[PDB]
Amino acid sequence: GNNQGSN
Amino acid sequence: GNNQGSN
Amino acid sequence: GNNQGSN
Amino acid sequence: GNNQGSN
Amino acid sequence: GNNQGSN
Amino acid sequence: GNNQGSN
Amino acid sequence: GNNQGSN
Amino acid sequence: GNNQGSN
Amino acid sequence: GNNQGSN
Amino acid sequence: GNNQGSN
């Protein structure tokens, strides 16, 4: 799996 | 902001 | 903002 | 599965 | 699975 | 911001 | 900011 | 698995 | 900022 | 696994 986030 | 993910 | 995902 | 969101 | 989010 | 992921 | 991940 | 985040 | 990861 | 974060 892959999880990517940006704020 | 909030980013949450699960695999 | 909020982003939530699940697989 | 794929989950994508943007705010 | 893939989870991607941006705020 | 907050980024959280789990595989 | 906070970044947290687990594999 | 991969977890990536940026604030 | 805080960065935390576990494998 | 890989965990990467930046603040």
Whats the size of chain B, residue-wise? 7
Q: Which amino acid is at J2?
A: N
Give the tokens for residue C2: 């909020």
Give the tokens for residue G6: 């687990």
Q: Using what technique was this structure determined?
A: X-ray
Interface residues from chain G to I (CB-CB < 8 Å): 1-7
Give the tokens for residue I4: 């935390």
Pairing of strands I2-6, B2-6: unpaired
Interface residues from chain I to J (CB-CB < 8 Å): 1-7
Question: Which run of H or of E encompasses E2?
Answer: strand E2-6
SS3 content of chain D, % helix, strand, coil (to 5): 0, 70, 30
The distance in angstroms from the start CA to the end CA of chain E is 21
Question: Cα(J7)–Cα(J5) distance, rounded to whole angstroms?
Answer: 7
Q: Which amino acid is at G5?
A: G
Q: Which residue of A has its CA nearest to E5?
A: A5
Longest distance between any two alpha carbons in chain B, whole Å: 21
Question: Cα(H5)–Cα(C5) distance, rounded to whole angstroms?
Answer: 15
